[PDB]
């Protein structure tokens, strides 16, 4: 019994987006329910709860003026509408929904990215030439990257600047959306 | 508002061993403290919903315990199953709120990373631009330091369960030229050791 | 197989708790030891008690075992008794189990206070709630101040995220408070915040919960709050005393008083545990009863458990070898 979210997004700093969610059981105006805001160094935050019986929900006043919620129910679709983005109001926002049972309902994340874009791009070598071998790790570089890129194999994390992602992976064959 | 200091962002831990994650929160909260399970590239879970109970499908490995304002996750005879982030949560009051979220590890003994240094490639230069990297793999202790300015750096997560790291300098090719004349420690470590020559 | 107690119309709220109270041991012990509670040399002969006494007639036969097969009892004997005290039922909103208890246990206190000058042993429903405040700037306390109950009468709170809500959470959103913002400290000698204690000071034996489910609306109307509490049989109520000391105080569950439907179709029902004296007048029991007025029925314990509570009569054990 899932409870599916909308696809991730990405636009401009100062528009405005609203995400969806909707699951494969009903008594959905028959609970509350809520939405969370994850990014990694900050952590998690409750922005507020929805009343889908009817609509006159609770926000947390640190969001009040930049989040707003609405709901239906004949068509299982729970709303969430966020305004004035800045590359700061980039995380992940989940949808939950309680039970008393079973622990409470979870969807699958959203991953809202906001950054001044709208690339396919290129990749380097790094070889150990010098030879001071007294066996050997190499790899390569990808720069600006979602990148899709065999064991004794390390691969790191995107860090990204400009929505340009430097990331780097490790053991030519650098084979070890975008395309090739 | 409500906040709620966690202890750590970072426990060791054995297999089969008893570990205790914490909470401590800025005002009394009652028996209102929710705690919270996440593995990389998840949803959360509910782990526990009053300051002790038990969801469904949640092992008795789990309690919960506290009051008021100190509260505690113990986990006993840990399984290869529980290496995960746990938060807690509040729902005394509105707005609710949660902690920073620690994430839990096998121990073991420590050992030294593997190091490489690599130098600007002909592609590299042949688009501009020039850029260094240093590759600090296999790393069994967590706070390493490595380091002028520039510097942009990216770590894995635990793996056998060693780190490792990328390290990176960038710049123009008349900047690489301007000076060829320019920290890999751990507390295995008695002093820095780095693998800058040209030519 | 305890006796029923006849309810035609107006006195089911009577008879379920009339059936809490038998549930409960050291309230018949109590009672026992109370009537029979007389000090020698006094030349003032002790006022009668008929309150005391009705209600331990009753108690006592709904405690043992049924003599009569399917027995039937009459509980009308009390009502008149009550009515020789101050009490005269005079609006729906008074037939009430709780506020029975209140004016029996008020009733047994005036019975108490009637004959002075010989000694009767205070009712094992009494308890103390404490009050007290510190200052956070100096980390000092005020001296304490004292309250009485005999029942813990817990407001429902209003969901937050959506968890179930425990016998716990409402517990401690009554016996805990908030701060002050102006009044002045001592040790710091000048305009100050300082936290509100509040904690209970004596337990009884004896412990009534109550559960406001049934209170007014906005506008005057009935309102029933119907959401599940959820509650266990063994209670411990170590982080709610006030002496900060190693000891323990562990309570066990003997009755549940439920309320079901409303207005025209509302009802009360108790569960409680079967009699102890299976030839073993000293073992209580773990089998539990559903106790209709006239009905009797066994029930297990999920059953208790899952029914939606107004009174829970808790009683103090030791340990929990059972
Ligand atoms: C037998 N079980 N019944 C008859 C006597 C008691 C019940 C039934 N009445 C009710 O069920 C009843 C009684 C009182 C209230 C009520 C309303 N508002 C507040 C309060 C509490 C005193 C604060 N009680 C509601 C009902 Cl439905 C008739
Ligand atoms: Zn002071």
Redesign the interface.
Same mark, same amino acid.
Do not use: C, R
């Given at each position: 019994v899932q409870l599916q979210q909308s696809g991730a997004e990405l636009v401009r700093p100062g528009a405005s987006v609203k995400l969806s969610c909707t699951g494969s059981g009903f008594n959905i105006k028959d609970t509350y329910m809520?939405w969370v805001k994850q990014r990694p160094e900050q952590?998690?935050?409750?922005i507020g709860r929805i009343d889908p019986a009817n609509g006159n929900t609770?926000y947390?006043?640190?969001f009040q003026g930049k989040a707003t919620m609405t709901a239906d129910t004949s068509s299982n679709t729970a709303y969430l509408q966020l305004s004035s983005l800045t590359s700061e109001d980039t995380a992940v926002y989940?949808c939950a929904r309680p039970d008393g049972?079973?622990?409470?309902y979870?969807?699958?994340?959203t991953t809202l990215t906001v950054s001044s874009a709208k690339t396919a791009p290129?990749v380097?070598?790094?070889?150990?030439?010098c030879g001071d071998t007294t066996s050997v790790?190499?790899?390569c570089?990808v720069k600006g990257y979602p990148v899709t890129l065999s064991s004794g194999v390390?691969?790191?994390?995107?860090?990204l600047?400009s929505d340009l992602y430097?990331?780097?992976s490790?053991v030519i064959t650098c084979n070890v959306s975008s395309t090739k | 508002d409500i906040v709620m200091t966690q202890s750590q962002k970072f426990m060791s831990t054995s297999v089969g061993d008893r570990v205790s994650v914490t909470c401590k929160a800025s005002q009394?909260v009652? %028996?209102?403290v +929710?705690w919270y399970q996440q593995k990389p590239g998840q949803?959360?879970?509910?782990?526990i919903? #009053?300051?002790?109970?038990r969801?469904?499908?949640?092992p008795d490995r789990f309690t919960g315990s506290g009051?008021?304002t100190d509260f505690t996750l113990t986990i006993s005879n840990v399984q290869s199953e529980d290496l995960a982030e746990y938060?807690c949560?509040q729902?005394?009051?509105?707005?609710? %709120?949660?902690? +920073?979220?620690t994430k839990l590890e096998l121990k073991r003994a420590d050992a030294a990373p593997?190091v #490489?240094?690599?130098?600007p490639?002909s592609?590299?230069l042949t688009?501009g631009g020039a850029?260094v990297?240093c590759?600090l793999?296999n790393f069994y202790p967590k706070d390493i330091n490595v380091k002028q300015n520039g510097v942009?750096?990216?770590?894995?997560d635990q793996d056998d369960s060693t780190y490792?790291?990328?390290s990176?300098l960038?710049l123009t090719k008349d900047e690489y030229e301007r000076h060829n004349s320019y920290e890999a420690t751990h507390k295995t470590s008695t002093s820095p050791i780095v693998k800058f020559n040209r030519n | 197989l305890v006796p029923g107690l006849v309810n035609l119309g107006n006195t089911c709220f009577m008879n379920s708790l009339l059936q809490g109270l038998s549930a409960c041991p050291a309230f018949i012990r109590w009672l026992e030891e109370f009537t029979s509670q007389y000090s020698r040399d006094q030349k003032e002969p002790p006022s009668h008690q008929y309150l005391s006494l009705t209600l331990l007639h009753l108690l006592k036969a709904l405690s043992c075992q049924e003599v009569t097969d399917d027995e039937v009892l009459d509980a009308s004997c009390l009502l008149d008794v009550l009515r020789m005290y101050r009490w005269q039922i005079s609006s729906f909103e008074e037939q009430d189990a709780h506020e029975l208890f209140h004016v029996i246990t008020s009733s047994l206190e005036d019975e108490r206070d009637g004959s002075g000058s010989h000694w009767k042993s205070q009712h094992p429903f009494h308890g103390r709630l404490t009050s007290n405040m510190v200052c956070k700037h100096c980390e000092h306390q005020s001296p304490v101040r004292f309250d009485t109950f005999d029942s813990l009468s817990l407001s429902i709170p209003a969901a937050?995220?959506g968890?179930?809500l425990?016998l716990?959470?409402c517990?401690?959103?009554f016996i805990?408070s908030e701060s002050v913002r102006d009044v002045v400290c001592d040790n710091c000698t000048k305009r100050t915040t300082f936290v509100k204690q509040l904690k209970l000071g004596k337990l009884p034996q004896c412990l009534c919960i109550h559960l406001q489910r049934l209170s007014w609306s906005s506008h005057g109307t009935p309102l029933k709050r119907h959401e599940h509490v959820?509650f266990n049989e063994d209670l411990s109520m170590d982080?709610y005393k006030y002496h900060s000391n190693a000891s323990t105080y562990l309570f066990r569950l003997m009755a549940v008083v439920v309320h079901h439907g409303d207005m025209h179709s509302g009802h009360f029902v108790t569960y409680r545990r079967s009699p102890p004296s299976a030839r073993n007048p000293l073992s209580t029991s773990n089998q539990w009863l559903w106790v209709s007025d006239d009905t009797v029925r066994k029930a297990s314990l999920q059953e208790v458990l899952s029914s939606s509570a107004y009174l829970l009569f808790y009683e103090r054990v030791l340990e929990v070898l059972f």
């Open positions: 809520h952590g998690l935050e409750w609770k947390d006043p640190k989940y049972y079973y622990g409470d979870w969807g699958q994340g290129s380097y070598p790094l070889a150990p030439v790790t190499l790899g570089l390390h691969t790191f994390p995107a860090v600047q430097t990331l780097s490790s | 009394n009652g %028996t209102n +929710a949803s959360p879970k509910a782990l919903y #009053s300051a002790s109970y969801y469904s499908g949640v009051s008021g938060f949560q729902y005394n009051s509105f707005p609710l %709120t949660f902690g +920073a979220g593997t #490489s240094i690599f130098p490639s592609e590299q688009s850029s990297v590759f793999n942009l750096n990216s770590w894995t490792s790291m990328s990176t960038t | 937050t995220w968890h179930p425990t716990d959470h517990l401690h959103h805990s959820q982080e």
